[PDB]
Write a protein that holds these residues in place. Structure first.
Motif, PDB file in Angstrom:
ATOM      1  N   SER A 246       0.714  -1.433  -0.012  1.00 26.21           N
ATOM      2  CA  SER A 246      -0.019  -0.333  -0.240  1.00 26.21           C
ATOM      3  C   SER A 246       1.075   1.349   0.355  1.00 26.21           C
ATOM      4  CB  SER A 246      -0.901  -0.322   1.121  1.00 26.21           C
ATOM      5  OG  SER A 246      -1.580  -1.000   1.229  1.00 26.21           O
ATOM      6  N   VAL A 250       0.045   3.841  -3.096  1.00 25.39           N
ATOM      7  CA  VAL A 250       0.144   4.883  -2.412  1.00 25.39           C
ATOM      8  C   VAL A 250       0.920   6.187  -3.035  1.00 25.39           C
ATOM      9  CG1 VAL A 250      -0.699   6.080  -0.692  1.00 25.39           C
ATOM     10  CG2 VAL A 250      -2.005   4.242  -0.958  1.00 25.39           C
ATOM     11  N   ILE A 298      -5.148   3.427  -2.037  1.00 30.21           N
ATOM     12  CA  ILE A 298      -4.860   4.010  -3.585  1.00 30.21           C
ATOM     13  C   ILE A 298      -6.973   4.608  -3.351  1.00 30.21           C
ATOM     14  CG2 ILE A 298      -5.848   4.505  -5.559  1.00 30.21           C
ATOM     15  CD1 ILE A 298      -3.265   2.159  -5.985  1.00 30.21           C
ATOM     16  N   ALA A 301      -7.271   6.519  -0.345  1.00 33.76           N
ATOM     17  CA  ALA A 301      -5.576   8.391  -0.594  1.00 33.76           C
ATOM     18  C   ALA A 301      -6.805   9.153  -1.788  1.00 33.76           C
ATOM     19  CB  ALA A 301      -4.110   8.045  -0.966  1.00 33.76           C
TER      20      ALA A 301
END
Ligand SMILES: O[C@@H]1[C@@H](O)[C@H](O[C@@H]2CO[C@@H](O[C@@H]3CO[C@@H](O)[C@H](O)[C@H]3O)[C@H](O)[C@H]2O)OC[C@H]1O
Ligand SMILES: O[C@@H]1[C@@H](O)[C@H](O)OC[C@H]1O
Length: 302
Positions: A246, A250, A298, A301
């Motif tokens: 992640s 991200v 994602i 975010a």
């Protein structure tokens, strides 16, 4: 299909798309794959159907079955398309690489660009006109094109592409443009500045971004460096990260999100089993075609 579309969320930030790849096999191997593509991604790049080996296996004889299918699927489902790739040293038929006469190669080059581009004229958002033409040190790769024609092949390819389809964004694509200060990044930048000053129609720089675990954080600086070349836009064209953490994913998404020139991100595959780097589980969907942690990361975010 994931309930939340990262493409929709990325577009909400003013980006053009967050896409992926496909071709007949992955689009029909099961029900989840095409369903994921339609629900969570907004652009498609043909994984292999538009390459030289698959489009012009013999001199002047074109085979467009696979590419037609990909384009038709994307167009039928509102997906933008990135053509890939017109000029490349890999997956290039022997008949091309054996040519030694400059004028003969230029003729062949122009006919290939013209026929492939004309067939999808007006349906392509961006074309990777040139793929991987640099050595790691920033010098030009000694491919048949460079060896026989010389550096002028760069001008010829882009100018031919521009006149054939003035609606498509013309890109130069490459890998290892993943950290500011890297020789290849410096070489890509200085060459594009030179080419743009000479009038060569280069609309964007594509950074493949095939990463190893932990390399995500350096991508932001790389994109910032690439933005200095002076092209209208840039894009992450073939994203995959070994381990699919992640943090890495991200970091890469934020890298594009926070750079004005980055119009979008294309992930090189949907699910791990169909990845060209499957042993490293580098994608957003797993063996069961289900969203992995990074996919949700994602989404949260954006
Ligand atoms: O038989 C063919 C396969 O050998 C071939 O495999 C593909 C190789 O290219 C991969 O896509 C490229 C990855 O590297 C980048 O730098 C290029 O820009 C990409 O285009 C692709 O993922 C593999 O499937 O192609 C399929 C068969 O026809
Ligand atoms: O299917 C083909 C389509 O993809 C192309 O754009 O135009 C010609 C058609 O035959």
């Amino acid at each position: 299909q994931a309930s939340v579309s990262i493409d929709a969320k990325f577009k909400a930030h003013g980006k053009k798309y967050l896409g992926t790849i496909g071709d007949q096999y992955t689009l029909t191997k099961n029900t989840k794959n095409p369903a994921i593509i339609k629900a969570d991604f907004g652009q498609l790049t043909p994984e292999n159907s538009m390459k030289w080996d698959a489009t012009e296996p013999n001199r002047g004889q074109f085979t467009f079955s696979g590419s037609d299918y990909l384009v038709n699927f994307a167009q039928s489902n509102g997906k933008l398309i990135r053509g890939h790739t017109l000029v490349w040293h890999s997956q290039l038929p022997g008949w091309v690489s054996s040519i030694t006469d400059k004028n003969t190669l230029i003729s062949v080059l122009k006919n290939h660009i013209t026929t492939v581009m004309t067939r999808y004229k007006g349906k392509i958002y961006a074309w990777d006109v040139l793929n991987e033409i640099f050595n790691e040190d920033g010098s030009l790769r000694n491919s048949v094109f460079y060896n026989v024609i010389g550096e002028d092949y760069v001008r010829i390819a882009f100018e031919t592409a521009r006149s054939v389809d003035p609606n498509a964004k013309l890109y130069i694509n490459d890998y290892n443009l993943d950290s500011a200060g890297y020789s290849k990044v410096n070489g890509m930048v200085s060459h594009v500045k030179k080419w743009l000053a000479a009038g060569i129609p280069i609309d964007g720089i594509g950074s493949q971004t095939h990463l190893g675990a932990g390399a995500g954080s350096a991508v932001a600086g790389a994109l910032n460096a690439l933005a200095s070349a002076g092209t209208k836009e840039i894009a992450i064209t073939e994203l995959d990260i070994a381990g699919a953490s992640s943090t890495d994913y991200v970091n890469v998404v934020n890298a594009c999100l926070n750079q004005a020139k980055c119009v979008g991100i294309t992930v090189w595959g949907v699910a791990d089993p169909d990845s060209w780097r499957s042993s490293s589980s580098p994608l957003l969907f797993d063996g069961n075609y289900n969203p992995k942690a990074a996919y949700n990361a994602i989404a949260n975010a954006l």
